[PDB]
Write a protein that binds this ligand. Structure first.
Ligand code: CLA
Ligand code: CLA
Ligand code: CLA
Ligand code: CLA
Ligand code: CLA
Ligand code: CLA
Ligand code: CLA
Ligand code: CLA
Ligand SMILES: CC1=C(/C=C/C(C)=C/C=C/C(C)=C/C=C/C=C(C)/C=C/C=C(C)/C=C/C2=C(C)CCCC2(C)C)C(C)(C)CCC1
Ligand SMILES: CC1=C(/C=C/C(C)=C/C=C/C(C)=C/C=C/C=C(C)/C=C/C=C(C)/C=C/C2=C(C)CCCC2(C)C)C(C)(C)CCC1
Ligand SMILES: COC1=C(OC)C(=O)C(C/C=C(\C)CC/C=C(\C)CC/C=C(\C)CCC=C(C)C)=C(C)C1=O
Lengths: 161, 84, 28, 34, 138, 105, 732, 42, 80
């Protein structure tokens, strides 16, 4: 399947993009003297460009008829690096930020500086919570089953209905 | 008639004209309707493709027994649990 | 194609909804 | 009288007469004290 | 009673004063007594000179009179001012302070108008007064 | 046609060149301008009510702040609105002007 | 007291210009009028409905009449893909000679407007061939208009006013509307097609003169009464049939071919006839469900009261809803608008993909006009549905009588609903805008290969399931071996698969990463518009900031600057805010439709595929590129036929921008200014002879919002309409 | 280190800016040393 | 005229009366609260609907409420 796509290493359009990009850069390069700072800058761009195109060619990312990488995000594991693995990374980090932030908020509410510690952070206290985020999934799961994650509906304010 | 009900079982009067019909009548008829209806669908469409010259009115009529059997088995359960 | 006679018949007939519209408008 | 004359007769009436009669009538209506 | 012949503060005039509606609908008068000559701000803009003794001003709106009243009270400690509504036909209603005492001070004799014997959350739903003249807050 | 459409050709064709920053700023500035209209056309009564529902979700999960969220004041809504309107509007012209005059001048 | 408006003493006693404005604006809110009874209300609504129907029929009459008289229908049918159809003649004494010439290029010797409504295509399909056919049509619809007008008048006369009980006879109305209004109308239309449209398509004249003697099929109704119905399918039009001729013509009157007539690029007429016959049967059967005068059938109240899930997750279920709905015209109108809003969108989507009118797929400007028209109408209907839902909650909802039913339980978790809609809108917004901006920056710095381009594989899979072979998914109708494929192979599948797999039509367009991003943009628009409208409805009765809001009504300015300030707190204000979002969403989707088609029709799909993944692509390749024909409608060198669209385009910009005055500057500024003008008038000699009867005042707070929104919306449509039309005319 | 100064360094905007700047630096430095990661390599 | 109503949660603080720029309101004797007084609205024909009274009211929810109604020259605040 994906008959409308092709591997970028097999793509003639993808290869022509490399050629045309480099050809432009080499024209720009000819305007400067060998050894000059300008010349070296353009050379670095040429190397970086070559590295990028070759990296994508060796990856097995698919290319459209435009000759550009198209990502598959349906769950199949042959394209896990395109979305699933980035997703797991994002969830782990974002959940950490949320979990440690929630923990700090609750800690300061049990003090006389509940408001002060929101605008002037208790940095030792904050770093303790930030340091404890690495197992937030298990923490959060246990807190849920203990009945400590959520307030009851009758204990939260609501408007008339 | 107020048809509102509480708890786990509706009270037979929801069945309308079929409120006095016994549980066994509904339950057996539901199995028969499902099997005959399934057979009509199979014969019409699945055993060889349907063509313009091979539309049997009985199989078309018979296919309506499939949704009808659903209703019959719900009515059967209602009567079963009401004691009827 | 369409004659003067046909256009006048239309205009005359359009007086019927005109008058009736007036009546409905007033009654509302 | 022909039909091709009709736009030149009607458009001035629908555009410069009918609206100003309507505006005048509505103005009289909304200012009536009764 | 008002007294139409009472003297006015000294003022060079402005374009902010009253217009036709004051002549043929209604205007308001404020009188007061001052101990000394004093400059104050007209609610229609500009400085005017308060006479020592009696002072009479006319305005288009009740709110202009009361605004001046508040200025008299706050800035000059004058609390003896009176406000009247004056009709074109010559009739005069006394407005404020209605019964001699300022409204912010409790006074026996006053009767509760527009009070309700419930909290605001116990008003009926709009649907209940549908097709009758009642309001939900009545 | 002869001013806006014709002279915008430089800024609008700047991607992939050294003038690409102006192309980006031109679009970015159109965005900030349009975003200003959210503040100018709305009022805080709507926003304070929306915040109430969001606060409900935070209270449910025991993560509501002690510094209570409020919608911006009426005046701040106006200030934010005009500040984004001006920034967006002026930066659009800036990008338009520079991209054009650097190409032809 | 000034009498107008007679229906509101409160307004009639107002001494200012506000009396007139508010008089006009509340004239159709009958429930709010002085001394209205429930019976009078229903009677007045019924008569107003007759008035509205008459207007629809006069409008249709006018379209027919103008084309008959001033059009070129008879010439157009001889060469439909080349000749431009005429809407009506122009008579405008402001025109100079150069403009007269520019608008006189359509074959005929007088200035005209070209039609983009698709009426010629429709009328030709359904069997009209002459100006006399059109003229008699126009005459007929004049008479129908008058009839409805008369019925309107009649049903306000004492002895013909219907009772309130008649108006709340739900079961009878449903039976008649399903079986009669829908079912029989559909059956009669199948009759028209079989007796007239299909013969006329095969070159045979059938009219009132000969239709009693002309059989639609040689076999007559003999096969019908003998149950030999397959006779009516034998001998379809060949693939070489030339429309409006006998060359390649068939004899079949009912078929299931699927796909398109090759010449006309439109659905087969024999398929359309059979469609209408089949649904007519279903509708007629459906209209025997409800109990009227003969004991059989269902009570709507009994069905509703019984539908409670026994596990208790829906509480008391639908108990109480019958009374709630039966006593609320706003609930009913909200249901009607929502349902019609969905259907109008479905019309837009299905008519571009599966056109029914001959040669309309070739008329690109008409196709674009019709899609945009119906999607905008649908947008308005959807907002209105929710507006009336909010009005229902204030005016008609009785908490006591709905206790613990599905409607009451919506209010019980309104914070959960609103907060989740907020989340999904933010989630879509941050990421869709984010990806677009990633793509813009990386393309701007000369690396389009760094773009994030997600294939819309789920949508491609659904296309494959209907038999699109391009993707190689080998699923269902795109696999030879599937039971789905086998089942339909002798019926509609050959015709359908041909149309699907043809790249030169709009039936399942190819979709790529560009289509992915704009679909998430559309999703953002649907969710956010819904957020605003749902928050409007569910908070209409009250909030923490204003717990007693139901006591103030649907529309009111605010509750003053206390408690932090309360501008735009009413449920009406939610409608106002939602309108901006509805227009935005409709912008995005119509821009999408149009650009996708401009590049398809122009044979450069690659332009769309490459440019659409970053926002500068839309700005440059869509807006800037396609503006050129439009803005040159007039210039220093002369005028062409796009002159009028060029002028309208600028008119739209002006009206839109004038709207900003009302939306940004608010009332108090203006009231102070008007005071100084009142001062000047009274103190100016000569002028001050003249006196106003109504004291001039600045517009109200709500009036400004409404007037601003009106200008914004009118300007939106009058800008886009010329662009979408002139862009396409200019290119093709 | 002076307690009043440390209290000032603990205010929301100061910590806000420092923390965002460090985060931004980390992302910049990852992209400076491992450029053009459209996907996780595997 | 605008409707002004005073509800029985009034604590007789007098702040609404003090806030009112049109002298619509006054304090009258009452038994229902510790202050032994309640707000009253005897002159609503002079009410402009500015809602300064509601801004001043300390109770939750309000004890004074202004329902905007039929406009007059007085209520629209016209000096012409
Ligand atoms: C529309 C919703 C949807 C959802 C929630 C998922 C979810 C998942 N799919 Mg995907 N998938 C989808 C549509 C969806 N898929 C479609 C339409 C296709 C055909 C294009 C696929 C083709 C697909 C493949 C080939 C695979 C997945 C796999 C997965 C799992 C990783 C995850 C459960 C992977 C899996 O291992 O499933 C258990 C896997 O190998 N999916
Ligand atoms: C620890 C902080 C924290 C946590 C756990 C949550 C959690 C949530 N928010 Mg809230 N939110 C926060 C801060 C937080 N928020 C802040 C500061 C704002 C003001 C911008 C908001 C504004 C907001 C809105 C408008 C909405 C939510 C919603 C939600 C819910 C869905 C996820 C989401 O949409 O986030 C989206 C939130 C953002 C994009 C805001 C940025 C979050 C910042 C970066 C976190 C700040 C971290 C803090 C400074 C760390 C200090 C810790 C240290 C001292 C130890 C979820 C319950 C949604 C909801 O109600 O769903 C039901 C919703 O609509 N939030
Ligand atoms: C989980 C889904 C579900 C469940 C458990 C129920 C359960 C119930 N339904 Mg409900 N119903 C549902 C979904 C459901 N419904 C849906 C989706 C609809 C359509 C919107 C309905 C429409 C409906 C109606 C109109 C009625 C009920 C009624 C009932 C109650 C009695 C059922 C009965 O009498 O069966 C026995 C039913 C039969 C033996 C008839 C078979 C079903 C039909 C006829 C098949 C269709 C055939 C064809 C299309 C029509 C004939 C064509 C031609 C021959 C003329 C029961 C509590 C009854 C009720 O509430 O009493 C007050 C009732 O009158 N239901
Ligand atoms: C779709 C779901 C649905 C369901 C669950 C029902 C269920 C029912 N129908 Mg209804 N009906 C339906 C659709 C449905 N109908 C449709 C589409 C029509 C139009 C043809 C009808 C026309 C119809 C009539 C005219 C009557 C029923 C009747 C009935 C009831 C007894 C039928 C029976 O077989 O008892 C054994 C049963 C409650 C009967 C009844 O008792 O209604 C109260 C009855 O007289 N049905
Ligand atoms: C009004 C609807 C209607 C419908 C749906 C039908 C349907 C049918 N008719 Mg009937 N028919 C009808 C009206 C209708 N008829 C009328 C009004 C008459 C005049 C009495 C007939 C006289 C008639 C005859 C003589 C025969 C049929 C037959 C049939 C069946 C065709 C079977 C076949 O040969 O293939 C089919 C079920 C045929 C049949 O039943 O063969 C098994 C058949 O021989 N019909
Ligand atoms: C079948 C459709 C239908 C029906 C019967 C109703 C009926 C009603 N609506 Mg509803 N409504 C609808 C659709 C409908 N509406 C739709 C589609 C929307 C979304 C736009 C709404 C949104 C809506 C709101 C927000 C409100 C209503 C209200 C009402 C009530 C009357 C208000 C009135 O007096 O109008 C008079 C209307 C006007 C005077 C406006 C003039 C027309 C507009 C501004 C367009 C101007 C176009 C301009 C002239 C063109 C310029 C051309 C250019 C070239 C120069 C009445 C019960 C109101 C109500 O009171 O309920 C409590 C109310 O507040 N409706
Ligand atoms: C371009 C114009 C524009 C934009 C971008 C927005 C954006 C938004 N509107 Mg608004 N709106 C607009 C015009 C706009 N609106 C107009 C003209 C009106 C009519 C008055 C409204 C009326 C309106 C209503 C009534 C509602 C919205 C809501 C929303 C939110 C919808 C969900 C979303 O997309 O979250 C994603 C967020 C964004 C796309 C915002 C921009 C994010 C930026 C780019 C992040 C930049 C960070 C970066 C580090 C730079 C920092 C800058 C530096 C100086 C610090 C979103 C914040 C709704 C809402 O709040 O739902 C929760 C809502 O109910 N809008
Ligand atoms: C295009 C947008 C637009 C337009 C046309 C207007 C127009 C106006 N503004 Mg407004 N304004 C706008 C945007 C706009 N504004 C926005 C976005 C804001 C928010 C910041 C404001 C905020 C604002 C303020 C604060 C003030 C103005 C003022 C004015 C007036 C200036 C005096 C004047 O020029 O009279 C002449 C009118 C025009 C030039 C308008 C066009 C005239 C047309 C072309 C000619 C007439 C055509 C013909 C007679 C039509 C007949 C057709 C009919 C018979 C069918 C003028 C009415 C000021 C004012 O009132 O001055 C006294 C004022 O103080 N505006
Ligand atoms: C006598 C005569 C004549 C004459 C003619 C003419 C002069 C014509 C005209 C015509 C016309 C001049 C027409 C018109 C028309 C119109 C219409 C048709 C309208 C309608 C309307 C409507 C429909 C409306 C409605 C409504 C509204 C809008 C509002 C309120 C409500 C209602 C619903 C009521 C001649 C010479 C031929 C000769 C013979 C005889
Ligand atoms: C607020 C309110 C209101 C309103 C509301 C609204 C406005 C709503 C809307 C809504 C809507 C607007 C909805 C919609 C929906 C839809 C749906 C639900 C659909 C479905 C679908 C389906 C089921 C499908 C199927 C299928 C088939 C058939 C074939 C092909 C495939 C598929 C799968 C696609 C009211 C008045 C009630 C009142 C109360 C309140
Ligand atoms: C009438 O016009 C409007 C209002 O009322 C007058 C509004 O109120 C709002 C809503 C906007 C609000 C409440 C302001 C948004 C402010 C932000 C993003 C929150 C600030 C949060 C932080 C500093 C913490 C985040 C921390 C870090 C990232 C480090 C809008 C859109 C509006 O149109």
């Amino acid at each position: 399947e994906f008959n409308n796509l092709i591997p970028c290493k097999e793509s003639k359009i993808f290869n022509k993009r490399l050629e045309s990009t480099i050809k432009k850069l080499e024209n720009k390069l000819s305007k400067y003297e060998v050894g000059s700072s300008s010349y070296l800058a353009i050379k670095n761009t040429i190397n970086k460009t070559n590295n990028r195109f070759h990296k994508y060619m060796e990856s097995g990312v698919l290319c459209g008829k435009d000759g550009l990488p198209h990502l598959i995000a349906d769950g199949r594991w042959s394209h896990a690096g395109e979305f699933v693995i980035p997703s797991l990374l994002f969830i782990y980090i974002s959940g950490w930020i949320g979990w440690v932030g929630r923990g700090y908020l609750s800690a300061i509410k049990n003090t006389n500086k509940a408001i002060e510690n929101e605008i002037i952070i208790d940095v030792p206290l904050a770093l303790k919570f930030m340091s404890s985020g690495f197992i937030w999934p298990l923490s959060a799961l246990r807190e849920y089953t203990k009945g400590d994650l959520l307030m009851k509906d009758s204990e939260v304010t609501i408007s008339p209905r | 008639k107020d048809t509102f009900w509480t708890g786990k079982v509706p009270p037979s009067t929801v069945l309308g004209i079929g409120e006095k019909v016994p549980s066994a009548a509904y339950i057996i008829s539901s199995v028969v309707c499902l099997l005959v209806g399934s057979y009509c669908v199979y014969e019409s469409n699945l055993l060889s493709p349907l063509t313009v010259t091979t539309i049997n009115p009985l199989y078309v009529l018979g296919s309506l027994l499939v949704p009808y059997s659903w209703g019959l088995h719900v009515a059967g359960w209602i009567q079963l649990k009401n004691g009827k | 194609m369409i004659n003067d006679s046909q256009i006048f018949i239309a205009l005359i007939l359009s007086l019927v909804p005109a008058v009736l519209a007036l009546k409905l408008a007033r009654e509302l | 009288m022909t039909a091709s004359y009709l736009p030149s007769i009607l458009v001035p009436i629908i555009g410069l007469v009918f609206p100003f009669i309507s505006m005048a009538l509505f103005f009289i209506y909304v200012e009536q004290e009764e | 009673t008002l007294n139409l012949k009472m003297p006015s503060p000294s003022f060079g005039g402005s374009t902010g004063g009253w217009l036709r509606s004051a002549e043929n609908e209604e205007k308001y008068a404020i009188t007061w007594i001052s101990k000394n000559e004093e400059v104050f701000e007209m609610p229609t803009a500009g400085a005017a000179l308060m006479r020592s003794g009696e002072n009479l001003l006319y305005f288009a709106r009740k709110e202009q009179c009361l605004s001046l009243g508040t200025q008299l009270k706050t800035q000059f400690k004058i609390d003896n001012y009176k406000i009247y509504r004056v009709f074109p036909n010559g009739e005069i209603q006394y407005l404020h302070p209605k019964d001699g005492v300022f409204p912010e001070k409790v006074n026996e004799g006053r009767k509760a108008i527009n009070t309700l014997t419930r909290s605001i959350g116990k008003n009926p739903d709009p649907v209940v007064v549908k097709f009758i003249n009642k309001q939900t807050f009545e | 046609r002869d001013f806006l459409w014709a002279q915008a050709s430089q800024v609008i064709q700047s991607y992939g060149s050294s003038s690409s920053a102006y192309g980006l700023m031109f679009l970015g500035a159109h965005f900030v301008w349009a975003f200003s209209l959210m503040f100018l056309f709305s009022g805080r009564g709507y926003w304070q009510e929306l915040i109430e529902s969001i606060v409900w979700a935070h209270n449910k999960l025991k993560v509501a702040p002690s510094i209570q969220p409020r919608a911006l004041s009426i005046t701040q809504g106006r200030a934010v609105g005009v500040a984004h309107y001006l920034l967006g509007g002026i930066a659009t012209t800036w990008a338009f002007f520079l991209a054009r005059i650097i190409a032809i001048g | 007291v000034t009498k107008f408006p007679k229906f509101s003493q409160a307004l009639a006693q107002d001494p200012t210009t506000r009396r007139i404005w508010y008089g006009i604006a509340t004239a159709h809110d009958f429930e709010s009028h002085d001394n209205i009874t429930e019976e009078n209300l229903y009677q007045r609504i019924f008569a107003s409905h007759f008035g509205h129907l008459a207007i629809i029929f006069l409008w249709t009459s006018g379209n027919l009449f103008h084309v008959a008289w001033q059009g070129n229908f008879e010439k157009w049918i001889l060469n439909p893909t080349k000749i431009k159809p005429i809407a009506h003649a122009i008579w405008d004494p402001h025109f100079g000679q150069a403009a007269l010439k520019a608008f006189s290029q359509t074959g005929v010797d007088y200035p005209t407007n070209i039609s983009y409504s698709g009426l010629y295509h429709w009328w030709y399909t359904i069997g009209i061939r002459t100006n006399n056919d059109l003229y008699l049509g126009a005459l007929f619809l004049l008479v129908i208009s008058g009839l409805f007008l008369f019925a309107g008048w009649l049903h306000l006369q004492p002895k013909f006013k219907p009772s309130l009980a008649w108006f709340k006879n739900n079961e009878s109305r449903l039976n008649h509307h399903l079986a009669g209004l829908f079912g029989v109308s559909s059956l009669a239309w199948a009759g028209h097609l079989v007796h007239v449209a299909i013969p006329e398509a095969r070159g045979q004249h059938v009219g009132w003169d000969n239709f009693l003697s002309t059989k639609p099929h040689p076999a007559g109704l003999e096969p019908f009464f003998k149950g030999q119905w397959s006779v009516y399918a034998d001998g379809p039009d060949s693939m070489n049939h030339v429309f409006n001729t006998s060359e390649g013509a068939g004899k079949a009157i009912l078929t299931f071919l699927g796909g398109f007539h090759p010449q006309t690029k439109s659905l087969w007429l024999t398929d359309i006839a059979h469609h209408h016959l089949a649904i007519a049967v279903i509708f007629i059967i459906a209209g025997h469900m409800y109990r009227t005068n003969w004991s059989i059938g269902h009570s709507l109240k009994e069905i509703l009261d019984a539908h409670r899930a026994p596990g208790g997750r829906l509480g008391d279920g639908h108990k109480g809803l019958f009374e709630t709905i039966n006593n609320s015209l706003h609930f009913q109108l909200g249901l009607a608008l929502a349902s019609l809003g969905v259907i109008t969108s479905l019309v837009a989507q299905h008519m571009y993909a599966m056109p029914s009118y001959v040669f309309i797929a070739n008329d690109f400007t008409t196709q674009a006009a019709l899609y945009t028209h119906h999607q905008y109408i649908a947008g308005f209907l959807m907002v209105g549905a929710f507006a009336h839902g909010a009005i229902f909650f204030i005016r008609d909802y009785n908490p006591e009588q709905n206790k613990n039913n599905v409607l009451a339980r919506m209010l019980e978790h309104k914070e959960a609903i609103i907060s989740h809609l907020s989340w999904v809108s933010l989630f879509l917004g941050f990421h869709t805008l984010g990806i677009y901006v990633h793509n813009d920056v990386v393309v701007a710095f000369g690396s389009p290969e760094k773009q994030i381009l997600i294939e819309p594989v789920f949508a491609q899979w659904i296309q494959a399931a209907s038999g699109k072979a391009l993707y190689g998914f080998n699923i269902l109708l795109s696999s030879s071996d599937s039971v789905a494929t086998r089942a339909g192979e002798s019926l509609w599948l050959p015709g359908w698969l041909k149309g699907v797999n043809d790249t030169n039509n709009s039936l399942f367009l190819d979709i790529g990463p560009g289509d992915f991003l704009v679909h998430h943009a559309i999703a953002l628009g649907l969710h956010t518009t819904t957020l605003i409208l749902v928050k409007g409805a569910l908070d209409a009765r009250g909030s923490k900031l204003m717990p007693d809001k139901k006591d103030f009504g649907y529309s009111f300015p605010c509750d003053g600057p206390g408690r932090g300030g309360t501008c735009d707190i009413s449920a009406w204000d939610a409608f106002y805010l939602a309108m901006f979002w509805m227009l935005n969403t409709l912008g995005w989707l119509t821009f999408y439709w149009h650009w996708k088609h401009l590049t398809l029709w122009g044979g450069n799909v690659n332009q769309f595929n490459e440019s659409s993944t970053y926002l500068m692509g839309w700005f440059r390749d869509y807006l800037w590129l396609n503006s050129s024909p439009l803005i040159n409608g007039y210039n220093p060198y002369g005028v062409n036929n796009l002159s009028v669209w060029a002028w309208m385009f600028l008119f739209g910009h002006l009206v839109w921008a004038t709207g900003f005055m009302f939306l940004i500057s608010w009332r108090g500024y203006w009231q102070e200014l008007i005071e100084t003008l009142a001062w000047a008038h009274e103190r100016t000699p000569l002028a001050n002879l003249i006196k106003w009867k109504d004291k001039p005042v600045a517009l109200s707070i709500v009036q400004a919002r409404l007037v601003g929104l009106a200008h914004f919306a009118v300007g939106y449509i009058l800008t886009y309409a010329p662009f979408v039309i002139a862009s396409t005319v200019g290119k093709f | 280190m002076n307690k009043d100064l440390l209290k000032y360094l603990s205010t929301a905007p100061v910590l806000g800016v420092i923390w965002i700047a460090i985060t931004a630096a980390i992302i910049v430095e990852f992209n400076r040393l491992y450029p053009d990661a459209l996907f996780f390599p595997l | 005229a605008h409707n002004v109503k005073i509800y029985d949660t009034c604590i007789g603080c007098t702040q609404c009366v003090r806030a009112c720029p049109c002298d619509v309101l006054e304090m009258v004797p009452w038994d229902g609260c510790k202050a032994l007084q309640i707000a009253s609205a005897p002159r609503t024909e002079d009410c402009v609907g500015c809602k300064r009274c509601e801004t001043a009211c300390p109770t939750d929810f309000l004890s004074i409420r202004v329902y905007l109604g039929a406009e007059t020259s007085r209520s629209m605040g016209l000096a012409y």
